Design a protein around this nucleic acid. Structure first.
Ligand SMILES: [Zn+2]
Length: 266
DNA sequence: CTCTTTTTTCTCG
DNA sequence: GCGAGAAACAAAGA
């Protein structure tokens, strides 16, 4: 789950669970609640879900007057809305039970996290994480982006993955964006010229907007269509749609990295 | 059997 | 401060 998938889950949850009173909460893996599971159970039992927001790849449940449950799905987390009599599945860890169904969180690798904080702690929480701007025309200012790139000698793919230039890209969309903007993932950012930075900035907004519209790439979220539009990620050895070269895969700062060697000149 | 592969945040030098 | 590497964890493939 990168930002488009997290947004897809957000929208689905907004439609289905807003207004629901939480009747009980149970955990088979309480250690993934970083603020303390029994504390969360005591605070949130009986409260009503008022909204669901998102910041970068983080989901934010708005519960009761002043609670915010910040949920990160990391690599494999999945939510589903199930009947109250639904059978347990192996990697289910937490559930919020409502009167007419339950929201279950599963995560094979156990990396995902829940943290309960108050409303007035949300903005500080994200400042402390140093998360950069949302990828929208309004919030993602190209001028600061350009200045940050000009001053760094980091490589472009790992710098984009830091979430500090702009929030929301992970391995799939970083590789897709760099192919679309014709930039090689190992390019040192201080080597990018103004026109390439402008194409990169717009391509980040466009590609994530597109992915959100198509319901993300593939429980909640499972209906996505963006996977059918990927041009490079997981396409090793297939032909680039623009130039016909084979897509290559290399390792860049520990991550699998897919690119077209003609279109993305080193 | 071993090794590699698949978001965030740490240690190490 | 930096980058390289790895850990947190589970499972599948070679
Ligand atoms: Zn190409």
């Amino acid at each position: 789950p990168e930002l488009p998938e997290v947004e897809t889950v957000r929208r689905e949850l907004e439609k289905r669970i807003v207004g629901q009173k939480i009747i009980s909460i149970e955990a088979t893996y309480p250690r993934m609640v970083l603020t303390g599971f029994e504390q969360l159970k005591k605070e949130l039992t009986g409260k009503t879900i008022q909204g669901i927001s998102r910041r970068g790849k983080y989901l934010i449940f708005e519960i009761g007057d002043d609670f915010r449950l910040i949920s990160h799905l990391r690599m494999e987390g999945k939510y589903r809305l199930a009947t109250l009599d639904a059978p347990r599945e192996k990697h289910d860890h937490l559930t919020m039970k409502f009167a007419d169904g339950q929201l279950i969180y599963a995560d094979v690798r156990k990396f995902g996290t829940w943290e309960l904080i108050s409303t007035d702690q949300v903005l500080p929480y994200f400042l402390k994480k140093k998360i950069g701007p949302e990828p929208t025309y309004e919030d993602f200012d190209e001028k600061l982006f350009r200045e940050k790139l000009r001053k760094s000698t980091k490589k472009i793919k790992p710098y984009l993955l830091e979430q500090t230039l702009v929030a929301g890209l992970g391995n799939i969309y970083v590789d897709e964006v760099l192919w679309l903007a014709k930039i090689h993932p190992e390019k040192e950012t201080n080597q990018l010229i103004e026109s390439s930075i402008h194409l990169l900035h717009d391509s980040i907004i466009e590609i994530l907007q597109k992915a959100i519209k198509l319901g993300g790439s593939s429980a909640l979220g499972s209906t996505g269509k963006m996977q059918n539009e990927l041009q490079v990620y997981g396409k090793t050895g297939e032909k680039c749609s623009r130039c016909g070269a084979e897509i290559q895969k290399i390792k860049v700062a520990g991550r699998g990295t897919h690119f077209c060697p003609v279109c993305q000149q080193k």
